[PDB]
Amino acid sequence: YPCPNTVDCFVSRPTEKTVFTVFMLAASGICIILNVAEVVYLIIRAC
Amino acid sequence: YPCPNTVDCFVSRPTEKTVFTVFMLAASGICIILNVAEVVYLIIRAC
């Protein structure tokens, strides 16, 4: 509402946003892996 | 085509056109009945 039925809306710079989305998500995934390795390394260091 | 998905289009004077449609169709139906009566009356006159 209030758009009647289904309307076609166009996203600004879909490909450019997709490229930066891939870069940011890949960096976030690297952060997740590094944080997991950080926990494992610290646990190994303690034990 | 080319209207995307379904669009809402508005008819000009829908009620006024409906009223005149009823008048014309009723008159046409009267013409049909009168023509049938014309054929029957002429057949009866011949026989």
Q: Does residue A2 have a cis peptide bond before it, meaning omega lies within 30 degrees of 0?
A: yes
The nearest CA of chain A is from the CA of B2 a distance in Å of: 12
Cα A7 to Cα A12: distance, rounded to the nearest angstrom: 16
Resolution in A: 2.9
Which residues in chain A touch residue B2, judged by CB atoms under 8 angstroms apart?
A: none
Distance from CA of A41 to the nearest CA of B (A): 56
B9 phi/psi in degrees, rounded to 5 = -115, 145
End-to-end CA distance of chain A: 60
CB proximity list for B11: less than 8 A, separation 6 or greater? B17
Distance CA A32, CA B4 (A): 43
Q: What experiment produced this structure?
A: cryo-EM
Q: Residues B31, B34, B38, B44: what is their CA dihedral angle, to the nearest 10 degrees?
A: 150
The helix/strand/coil state of A21 is helix
Q: Say if the Cβ atoms of B6 and A8 lie within 8 Å.
A: no
CB contact (8 A) between residue B5 and residue A8: yes
With DSSP H G I counted as helix, E B as strand and the rest as coil, what are the percentages for chain A, rounded to 5?
A: 70, 0, 30
Separation CA B43–CA B45 (nearest Å): 5
Q: What's the rounded Cα separation, in Å, for the pair A41 and B17?
A: 82
Q: Tell the residue number behind the tokens 């011949």, with chain if given.
A: B46
Residue B11, chain A, CB below 8 Å: the answer is: no
| HSE-up (13 A, CA, CB side) for residue B36 | 5
